[PDB]
Amino acid sequence: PQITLWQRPLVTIKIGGQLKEALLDTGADDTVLEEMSLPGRWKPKMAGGIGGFVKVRQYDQILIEICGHKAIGTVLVGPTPVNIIGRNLLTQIGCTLNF
Amino acid sequence: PQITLWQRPLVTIKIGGQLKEALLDTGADDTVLEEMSLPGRWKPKMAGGIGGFVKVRQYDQILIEICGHKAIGTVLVGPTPVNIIGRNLLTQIGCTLNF
Numbered sequence: 001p002q003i004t005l006w007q008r009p010l011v012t013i014k015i016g017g018q019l020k021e022a023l024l025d026t027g028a029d030d031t032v033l034e035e036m037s038l039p040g041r042w043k044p045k046m047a048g049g050i051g052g053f054v055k056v057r058q059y060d061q062i063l064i065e066i067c068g069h070k071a072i073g074t075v076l077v078g079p080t081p082v083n084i085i086g087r088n089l090l091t092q093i094g095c096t097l098n099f
Numbered sequence: 100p101q102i103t104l105w106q107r108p109l110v111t112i113k114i115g116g117q118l119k120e121a122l123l124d125t126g127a128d129d130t131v132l133e134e135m136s137l138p139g140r141w142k143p144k145m146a147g148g149i150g151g152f153v154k155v156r157q158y159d160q161i162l163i164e165i166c167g168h169k170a171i172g173t174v175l176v177g178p179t180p181v182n183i184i185g186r187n188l189l190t191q192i193g194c195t196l197n198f
């Protein structure tokens with residue numbers, strides 16, 4: 001789909017059996033999700049945004065379906081105000097910017 | 100241009116007679132620039148990211164040229180680690196996401 005930017009580019013994802021809304025985010029290197037129930041092992045990590053740092057859990061090779069396109073990769077889980085799909089996954093669904 | 104997302108989507112901007120590099124950022128409502136010399140009047144404001152909140156200065160109707168496309172709008176100025184072009188300007192240069 002082509003997505004214009006008059007509203008937040010929010011898409012429906014399926015991750016770990018659950019349905020969520022997430023922001024397609026070209027200004028995010030990584031993918032950050034709200035506190036959620038994920039299976040597997042992790043490594044403590046800190047994500048750094050505007051205004052400072054959040055402690056996150058890092059899960060590798062997690063399956064996600066973003067607007068019906070499958071991607072496998074790293075997902076961060078922690079106290080983000082909004083679910084963020086970052087460029088690590090955007091590249092996998094063939095996502096481009098166009099102007 | 101079409102921009103893939105294997106690297107940060109950094110473009111050259113001209114703002115207030117100066118040249119800078121900024122991130123085309125679909126996950127940003129607003130445009131935030133590092134501390135810089137801007138002319139005019141302002142209003143104190145707080146921008147809120149992943150780590151909490153930064154105090155910024157809000158300037159209205161500021162001309163920016165982003166990859167050679169002029170846009171006029173609100174620019175926020177403050178202690179961001181990266182220059183961010185938000186959807187408020189991205190819509191003016193006809194920027195879309197495509198997958």
Ligand SMILES: Cc1cccc(C)c1OCC(=O)N[C@@H](Cc1ccccc1)[C@@H](O)C[C@H](Cc1ccccc1)NC(=O)[C@H](C(C)C)N1CCCNC1=O
Nearest residue numbers: 027028029030032049050081126127128129147148149181
């Ligand atoms: C950079 C990065 C590296 C690794 C992993 C991750 C998730 C990374 O990205 C984290 C990040 O905050 N990226 C920002 C841009 C970024 C990259 C590098 C350094 C600093 C920032 C931006 O794209 C997303 C983030 C989302 C958000 C946060 C809080 C509330 C609402 C939305 N959006 C915002 O902060 C914007 C700002 C820029 C005007 N924002 C805040 C006011 C409300 N609305 C809004 O749109």
